[PDB]
Amino acid sequence: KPTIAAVGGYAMNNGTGTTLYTKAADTRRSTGSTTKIMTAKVVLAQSNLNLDAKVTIQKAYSDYVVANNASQAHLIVGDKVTVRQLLYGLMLPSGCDAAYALADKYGSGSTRAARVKSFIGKMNTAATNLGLHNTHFDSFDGIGNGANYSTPRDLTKIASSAMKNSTFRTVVKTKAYTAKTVTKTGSIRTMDTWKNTNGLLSSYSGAIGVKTGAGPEAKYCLVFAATRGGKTVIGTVLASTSIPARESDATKIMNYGFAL
Numbered sequence: 001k002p003t004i005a006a007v008g009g010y011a012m013n014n015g016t017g018t019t020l021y022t023k024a025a026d027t028r029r030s031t032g033s034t035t036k037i038m039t040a041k042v043v044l045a046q047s048n049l050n051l052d053a054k055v056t057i058q059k060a061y062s063d064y065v066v067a068n069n070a071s072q073a074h075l076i077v078g079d080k081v082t083v084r085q086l087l088y089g090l091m092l093p094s095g096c097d098a099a100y101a102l103a104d105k106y107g108s109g110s111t112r113a114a115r116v117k118s119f120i121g122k123m124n125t126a127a128t129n130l131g132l133h134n135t136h137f138d139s140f141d142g143i144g145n146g147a148n149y150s151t152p153r154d155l156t157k158i159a160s161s162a163m164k165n166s167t168f169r170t171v172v173k174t175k176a177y178t179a180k181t182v183t184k185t186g187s188i189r190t191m192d193t194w195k196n197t198n199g200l201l202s203s204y205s206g207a208i209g210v211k212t213g214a215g216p217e218a219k220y221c222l223v224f225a226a227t228r229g230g231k232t233v234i235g236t237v238l239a240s241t242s243i244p245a246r247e248s249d250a251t252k253i254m255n256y257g258f259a260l
Contacts, residue, residue: 001021002253002255004237004240004249004253005241005242006221006237006239006240006241006246006249007024008151008236008237008239009152009235009236009237009238010022011224011253011257013231013232013257014225020233020256021256022153025151025153026152028134028151029150029151029238030148030215030218031148031155031213031218031238032213032217032218032221033071033094033212033213034142034150034155034213034218034221034236034238035123035137035139036090036140036141037159038123038127039099039103039141040091040102040171041161041165042122044087044162044165044167046106050083051082051167052082052083052084054080054081054082055101055104057076057081058101058104059077060100060112061104062075064096064097064100065096065097068144070096070097070143071093072097072098073089073090073095073097074191075101076181076191079184080181080182081182083102083105084167086098086102088177088194089179089194091174092177092194092195093194094211095194096141096143099140100116100140102140103116104116106122107122116140119140120138120140123137123140124136124137126158132154132158134151134153135150135155136148136149136150152236152238153236155223155238156235159209159210159211159223162210163225169208172196173201174196175195176193176194176196178193178194179191197212198211204224204250204254205226205228207225207226208226208227209234210225218238219238219239219240220241220243220245221239221246222240222246222247222249224250224254226254228258229258231258233254235253
């Protein structure tokens with residue numbers, strides 16, 4: 001059993017559900033942007049889902065990333081961006097502006113505030129439906145709050161559920177993506193290329209996911225997944241000490257899991 005810097009860790013065989021590694025696996029901690037996995041999951045399960053549906057980037061999305069010094073996809077106010085493009089902006093550079101856009105779009109309500117509230121409710125309803133008991137969302141992106149928490153086991157179960165969706169799988173294993181959006185003049189704008197923050201995609205052979213996280217309370221987090229020899233290992237590390245450490249933590253757990 002490897003030792004890791006993260007104070008919380010968990011991994012299982014994605015196909016069988018069998019546990020492969022644990023370290024305070026059921027201890028509630030902050031999630032950082034790994035919460036965005038649930039945001040993507042909820043969006044992709046909406047009945048009225050249309051990946052080609054366009055969303056106008058509101059000034060509020062930009063003001064939001066600035067006010068919260070949140071990671072962003074650099075979405076340009078006024079641009080028309082598709083839900084598919086928003087999902088890539090959400091998962092690759094960890095676009096909290098894209099998260100806001102998705103919540104505004106899919107929440108139920110007559111105001112952005114009401115729709116955001118409704119969307120977070122959907123996130124909690126999805127957790128409940130998975131039979132989770134140590135997870136609660138108070139945001140659509142993991143930005144702030146003691147009422148936003150999960151555990152390495154719970155997040156791994158949310159990730160496993162999300163990975164059942166082919167679109168989700170396609171997105172989280174993508175290393176680079178360049179969005180071509182529509183400007184106010186109708187012209188097509190080529191945005192700066194987005195790079196997936198998950199270093200495992202290039203450093204770990206067989207890696208297929210899933211999502212990074214890093215904040216003042218959550219520290220360095222990573223939900224990982226890789227497939228080798230017909231076996232898929234999926235897991236989560238919470239509160240590692242740095243980006244390089246979170247990557248090695250995950251690398252060790254997966255290597256251990258594949259050898260078990």
